[PDB]
Write a protein that binds this DNA or RNA. Structure first.
Length: 14
RNA sequence: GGCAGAUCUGAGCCUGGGAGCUCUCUGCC
């Protein structure tokens, strides 16, 4: 998964 | 119990523009 935590791009498994 | 969401607007991780790991709020069954 794609997300964004504190205005940066973070991957959360797929 | 299980499920589904979650950001410079859920907290940490010394590699981190991020395939991994801890933990938790709210709704749903």
């Amino acid at each position: 998964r794609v997300r964004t935590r504190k205005g940066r791009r973070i991957r959360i498994x797929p």
